[PDB]
Amino acid sequence: SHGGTTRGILQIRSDQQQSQHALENFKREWKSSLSGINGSWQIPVVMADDIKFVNMTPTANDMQFEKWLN
């Protein structure tokens, strides 16, 4: 019912922060190629200097404080 459900952040290093128009076109390409069941198994390609993915939540979530409730 509230936020905090993010899996992680995809960082892309660049000398300049890309203009928002470029990021919107990036999103358009990403959605057209990968979004949904359509193109689910495909792999994108990017030629940036360095890319990282930092995890904000664990691999698999589950209920917390179960024994406390019991």
């Binding site: 928002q20 128009h21 919107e24 358009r28 949904g36």
Partner: protein
């Protein structure tokens, strides 16, 4: 009750600029005159060594226009006021988030139209009071009262740029900061100093000395096989810019897009 022109609501998206004055405003109104560049070069005169011609205001203006464009790209900003006719796609998550829209150019002085169309026919045109804006970031958000995506569903019109600053040492978010003015001047000075550094003595001359019938003279210029004559000023300008630019980027912030 309230009085206003229908596109502009005082709450949310107050009118800031008359559309006609977009054509009127120019570089000189923002202080980007050749006088400012000459003032920063106080005590320095640039001229053709072979004639008495100093470079005219035409070159200064052409440099300034390129310099402001370079600042327009060093930061993702629209500086001079201008009208935009913008189409945007339908993404469900932001549509459900109060029809969030991030304009491609910022800041937004005012928004004139915000419509949804299917084949060029407006399916739904929202009331003026509903839509609200955030000027500096360019966000447009809608607050109604009483496949997962599609292309170019909605249509947005607005004015992008910054107004000249009205009061000393101050600026509203929809108003030009002084720093952009100084940054653009510094960019112009980088080109001017590149031109002027070649005209110190002759052409490609580093050292000189004459000795004729008892009369002797010697000069050593800043020019060197490894550095230019004006490289010192360019280095100082770059040092100043790398602090001014980074300081200014904090005022606008980093960019994000959901994916």
């Amino acid at each position: 009750s309230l009085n206003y022109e229908y596109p502009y609501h005082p709450s949310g998206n107050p009118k800031h600029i008359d559309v006609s004055e977009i054509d009127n405003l120019t570089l000189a109104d923002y202080g980007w005159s050749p006088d400012a560049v000459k003032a920063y070069m106080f005590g320095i005169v640039v001229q053709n060594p072979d004639t008495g011609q100093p470079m005219g205001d035409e070159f200064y203006n052409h440099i300034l226009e390129r310099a402001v464009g370079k600042a327009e790209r060093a930061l993702d900003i629209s500086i001079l006021p201008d009208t935009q006719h913008e189409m945007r796609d339908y993404h469900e998550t932001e549509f459900n988030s109060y029809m969030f829209v991030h304009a491609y150019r910022k800041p937004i002085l005012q928004v004139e139209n915000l419509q949804l169309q299917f084949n060029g026919r407006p399916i739904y045109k929202y009331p003026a009071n509903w839509w609200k804006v955030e000027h500096l970031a360019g966000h447009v958000q809608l607050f109604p009262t009483a496949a997962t995506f599609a292309p170019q569903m909605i249509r947005l019109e607005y004015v992008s740029g910054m107004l000249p600053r009205k009061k000393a040492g101050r600026n509203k978010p929809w108003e030009m900061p002084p720093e952009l003015e100084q940054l653009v001047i510094k960019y112009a000075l980088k080109e001017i100093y590149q031109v002027w550094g070649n005209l110190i003595i002759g052409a490609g001359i580093a050292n000189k000395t004459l000795e004729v019938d008892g009369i002797t003279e010697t000069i050593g210029t800043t020019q060197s096989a490894m550095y230019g004559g004006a490289s010192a000023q360019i280095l100082q300008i770059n040092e100043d810019i790398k602090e001014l630019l980074d300081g200014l980027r904090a005022y606008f912030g980093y960019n994000m897009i959901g994916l």
